Design a binder for this molecule. Sequence first.
Ligand SMILES: Cc1cc2nc3c(=O)[nH]c(=O)nc-3n(C[C@H](O)[C@H](O)[C@H](O)COP(=O)(O)OP(=O)(O)OC[C@H]3O[C@@H](n4cnc5c(N)ncnc54)[C@H](O)[C@@H]3O)c2cc1C
Ligand SMILES: [Cl-]
Length: 365
Amino acid sequence: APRIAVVGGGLGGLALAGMLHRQGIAATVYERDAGRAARTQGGTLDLRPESGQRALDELGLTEAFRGEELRILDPAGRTLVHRVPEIDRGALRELLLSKVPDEAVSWGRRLTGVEELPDGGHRLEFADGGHADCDILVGADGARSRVRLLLTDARPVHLSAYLQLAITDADRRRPRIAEFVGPGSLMALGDNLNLGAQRSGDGTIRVSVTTRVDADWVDRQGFGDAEWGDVVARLHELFAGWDAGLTSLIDACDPGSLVGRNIEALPVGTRWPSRPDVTLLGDAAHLMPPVGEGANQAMLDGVLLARAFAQHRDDPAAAIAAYETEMFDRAAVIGAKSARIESMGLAPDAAERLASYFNRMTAAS
Ligand SMILES: Cc1cc2nc3c(=O)[nH]c(=O)nc-3n(C[C@H](O)[C@H](O)[C@H](O)COP(=O)(O)OP(=O)(O)OC[C@H]3O[C@@H](n4cnc5c(N)ncnc54)[C@H](O)[C@@H]3O)c2cc1C
Ligand SMILES: [Cl-]
């Protein structure tokens, strides 16, 4: 009856804990957040049949779980290509929490250190000064995982800056733009600089800026201290030369609503020697850019690892090793494909590359 500790009550950590519980296996989730909705989580996720949806199915949440047009543009506004499972992130977290016993999540416990024990297992050190011991440790603590360092010294590599703005109540307040975006999404591809817009089912349009810059670029802009007029002017300067129709999205956005982050990823094919009493899942195991659909993979990781523990109830080393063999292979395949997509879609000549792809395919007609 090993004491299993799961650091991180995110998508993967909760999926693991819920699936272990459904197999009769107790585990404790240690989560830095003060409560179940301490951190706002806006937007929607598309869950895939083989991953996100499979997890909800195995968790017993299939019932509970229940136009996506896409336009790709160039900076002049020309449509390069045209194409014609959704769940709110907050609602998904509620669904996952409903399958984890309430008393098995320790809120407000932020892992700051791990000390290996001679007899096996680990001592978990927390910011509040307390500790907890376990026999099995699962790192489910996200992109900046603290547990990851027990398995590998591999670090996330910086890829890009990502800025997120909003248009609230677009149908009433910005009807032209609402009609221009429509019910799906659009992405305009420039020179190491992309502009995206995605309509949500709550009446809002999310506007994004992605640009190939160094890790300190977001901080250097000082958006959080700037007057909104200056933020808009700087963004127009960033998009100099673009079609004024496209860049009017900037002026339509809710004043004061800009969140900036860095997009990063562990190197493709990252893996490690399997250890007998500790492992990783989700972003901790294999952080990828958003195109890697890491929410889906973290949920899949969680239920596959639980199945492995239940398949080897007398040997957690065998469970961890079986889980990792499959997880290493899946992460390598998806990581390589995500890296091709991320580097082709954000490039000095991104629009040209996309057009060339279809021009080439015509020759095979
Ligand atoms: C901009 C953006 C868009 C994305 N879009 C999509 C999409 O459309 N589809 C998709 O499938 N994926 C998407 N992803 C990826 C997805 O958000 C992540 O891959 C996913 O959340 C990984 O889940 P996780 O459980 O591994 O980590 P997380 O969900 O980040 O959970 C980690 C948890 O650990 C906690 N924690 C962290 N450190 C500690 C500590 N020291 N002690 C205790 N607790 C700690 C955190 O508070 C958190 O609760 C997107 C990601 C980004 C950045
Ligand atoms: Cl309008």
